[PDB]
Design a protein around this nucleic acid. Structure first.
Lengths: 182, 144, 77, 67
RNA sequence: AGCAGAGUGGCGCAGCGGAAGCGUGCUGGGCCCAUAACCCAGAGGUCGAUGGAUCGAAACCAUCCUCUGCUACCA
RNA sequence: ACGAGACUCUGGCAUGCUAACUAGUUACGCGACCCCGGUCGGCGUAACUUCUUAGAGGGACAAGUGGCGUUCAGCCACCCGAGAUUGAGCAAUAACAGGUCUGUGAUGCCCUUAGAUGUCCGGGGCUGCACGCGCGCUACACUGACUGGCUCAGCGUGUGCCUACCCUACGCCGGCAGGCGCGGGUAACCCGUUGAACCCCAUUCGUGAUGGGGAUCGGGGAUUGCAAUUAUUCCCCAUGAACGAGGAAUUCCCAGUAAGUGCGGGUCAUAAGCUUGCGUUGAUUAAGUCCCUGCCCUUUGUACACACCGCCCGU
């Protein structure tokens, strides 16, 4: 069981993403966006570094994640062009923190989902919409509007029970937020 | 027929080993150590069992007849040259071994060679090749 | 990158039989490969079911070969 | 970008020498069909004939040399 | 004797729920007529230890051990 | 004047020429089966070279047409046309401290010559394994694996001097590897119309280290040889490991070509994962370049000439 992290199916242009590299090809390289349900991406050979490289696997490092910026996307066709050269050194810590909050939210909701025993794609998307995407749209922040909401809801059960998802599933989610997020 | 029958036994516990029932009966019985592809066709030809059925729907009397063909294959008119263990150095009998006699008799033959101190036994004790082939270029997974 | 090791049933249960009998004669192209993909059964089992449906007369033959066979539905008119 | 350039198709008039580092490119003299007076030079990859009409994604650049 | 830091490949170091890596050292191969530079691959890990929470911890909990930052023999 | 070319061999065609019971074709008769007509690599004999064999001659030469070119050498496309670039053989001056004294009763010098570095017999070794490297073979599967049936070739070779050891149709026995009395060929006659493999068709298998892959290993039976153990080889049943399309780097090739697939010869008493030939199926891409690795000619530069893998300055 797996799905996308945020409510957007494909990210917008000039947006930072953390992506997992899969294989290296001739014109580009095949990657997998872990926060967008492992969709197909492309990184260019000339875009890997601003200076002269000596080997392809100087900067490939197959299996380890990296930070990229979306240069051109195609929402109707499902193609995203990634960029490695156009990144700032100060963006890496904020991207890592955002991915940390997103991955702990995904792990907590996956744990709550396997407790509640709801194994379906549409039902799992409904659980995400009733659990995290509602507060994300309420706080108007794609990722920063969720972890602060769990941090407030760990101490405020009235703020926790604002979403009308269920009763026993809401109690299980509150128990998971109380035990994990401390 | 093609619908699953009642008491369709999935896992078959035969001769203290694990046998899948989803495989063909000419091939599901080949998972037993000691019996292979060629001798499996003879056994299901002596017994009146067709080769078009899976192993998971057969019952006690036919699998019991097949186990009798396993244990005593000589007097069901299986030819003597079809066997794996012939003309024994201990007693001189023709027999087919099914993993227990096979494993302990292979172990007893290896300790017999190691006790008799033949160079086949010394090569088996050292952990080398016995059939007389070149070791200079191959066998690189011997020891670290 | 999910593996999802397929475990195809060797024979039909209850739901597969009427699911086949209601949906397979309502499809455009029928081959044992696409029957095994859609109904998560074995390849030879799909061949036996298609031979049964051919003997029943609800499927017309198009071409036969030792590699694969081609089957299609009846005309709805 | 944010601009869809309409695709124009052009027919050659004369083939020139083969350019490129390995000699894999070729200089051709193409001409437009919406107004048959304009002649530019483009870089093509692959074998071309005389009277062979090519598709052009853009109609604004000019042919550069082997470098 | 009192409070804190560190305990991770031969060496130094990053890490905090889904999970053994980095720089360096060693071995081997390629490139070349050959060597040095350059590239590739691998071996090398009780993550100091005990019991427990958790579906699941090297990290969370309590203790001890080893080396340091401050008080110093305080009767 | 040598080299290139010129020259030779082979392939590609000629219903024209010479010829065939050690090659066939076409007609005729007989015989066999079927429903009046088809099949016979069944039997036998009246012409012939259409198939086959191999001899002499012919044919392609930029020959024609349209362009480019100083309209000179030549180039491009097209028509008629079996081919408008088939493949090999031979291959100059100069030198290499290239390899061979283990090809030779070809060989200078040195060593040794009866307790022999000559020679012979018996046994062993050239195969022995922490590891690295090169040439190759089988596979990592469903364009597939197994099982039946259908169905098509060409190069070859064959009873040897001391030298004994040939290729094989046919009958029986045995699952098979194999065994015995029987017939031909010293070869277009006999194996043989060389019923080859890949392919073709029809079942079984169903994404599973699986019916892929056959390494390792146990037991048994035959053949060769005086002798197999460190299994010569072959056959039968078990045993079913690694391997999920392969890093840096690197090899070969452009038309019946690469590649897949099998058959001959060399070694051979027993004998091919090698090599040389042969045949079947049969493609992708390209008609260019000097970027890489190198080669040919002219000009220029040089402190080099055992020749840049050279020479040389300083702590």
């Amino acid at each position: 069981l797996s799905c996308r992290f945020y409510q957007h199916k494909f990210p917008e242009v000039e947006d930072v993403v953390m992506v997992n590299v899969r294989s290296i090809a001739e014109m580009g390289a095949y990657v997998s966006l872990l926060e967008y349900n492992n969709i197909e991406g492309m990184i260019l050979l000339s875009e890997l570094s601003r200076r002269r490289i000596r080997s392809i696997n100087k900067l490939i490092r197959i299996g380890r994640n990296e930070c990229v910026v979306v240069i051109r996307v195609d929402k109707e066709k499902g193609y995203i062009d990634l960029s490695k050269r156009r990144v700032s050194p100060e963006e890496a810590i904020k991207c890592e923190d955002k991915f940390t909050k997103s991955k702990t939210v995904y792990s907590i909701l996956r744990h709550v989902a396997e407790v509640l025993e709801y194994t379906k794609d549409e039902q799992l998307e409904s659980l995400f919409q009733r659990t995290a995407w509602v507060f994300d749209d309420k706080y108007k922040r794609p990722g920063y509007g969720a972890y602060d909401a769990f941090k407030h809801a760990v101490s405020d059960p009235s703020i926790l029970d604002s979403l009308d998802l269920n009763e026993d599933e809401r109690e299980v989610l509150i128990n998971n937020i109380n035990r994990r997020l401390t | 027929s093609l619908v699953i029958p009642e008491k369709f036994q999935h896992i078959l516990r035969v001769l203290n080993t694990n046998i899948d029932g989803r495989r063909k009966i000419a091939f599901a019985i080949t998972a037993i150590k000691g019996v292979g592809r060629r001798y499996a066709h003879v056994v299901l030809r002596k017994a009146d069992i067709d080769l078009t059925k899976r192993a998971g729907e057969l019952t006690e009397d036919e699998v019991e007849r097949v186990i009798t063909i396993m244990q005593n294959p000589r007097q069901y008119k299986i030819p003597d040259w079809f066997l794996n263990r012939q003309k024994d150095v201990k007693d001189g009998k023709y027999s087919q071994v099914l993993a227990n006699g096979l494993d302990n008799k292979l172990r007893e033959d290896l300790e017999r060679l190691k006790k008799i101190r033949a160079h086949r036994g010394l090569r088996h004790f050292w952990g080398l090749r016995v059939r007389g082939q070149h070791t200079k270029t191959t066998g690189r997974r011997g020891r670290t | 990158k999910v593996r999802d090791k397929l475990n195809n049933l060797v024979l039909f249960d209850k739901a597969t039989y009427d699911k086949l009998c209601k949906e397979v004669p309502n499809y455009k192209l029928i081959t044992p490969a696409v029957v095994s993909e859609r109904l998560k059964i074995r390849g030879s089992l799909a061949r036996a079911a298609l031979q049964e449906l051919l003997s029943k007369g609800l499927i017309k033959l198009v071409s036969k070969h030792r590699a694969q066979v081609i089957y299609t539905r009846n005309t709805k008119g | 970008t944010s601009r869809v350039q309409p695709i124009k198709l052009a027919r050659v008039t004369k083939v020139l020498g083969r350019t490129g580092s390995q000699g894999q490119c070729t200089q051709v003299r193409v001409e437009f069909m919406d107004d048959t007076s304009r002649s530019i030079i483009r870089n093509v990859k692959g074998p071309v004939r005389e009277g062979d009409v090519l598709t052009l994604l853009e109609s604004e650049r000019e042919a550069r040399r082997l470098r």
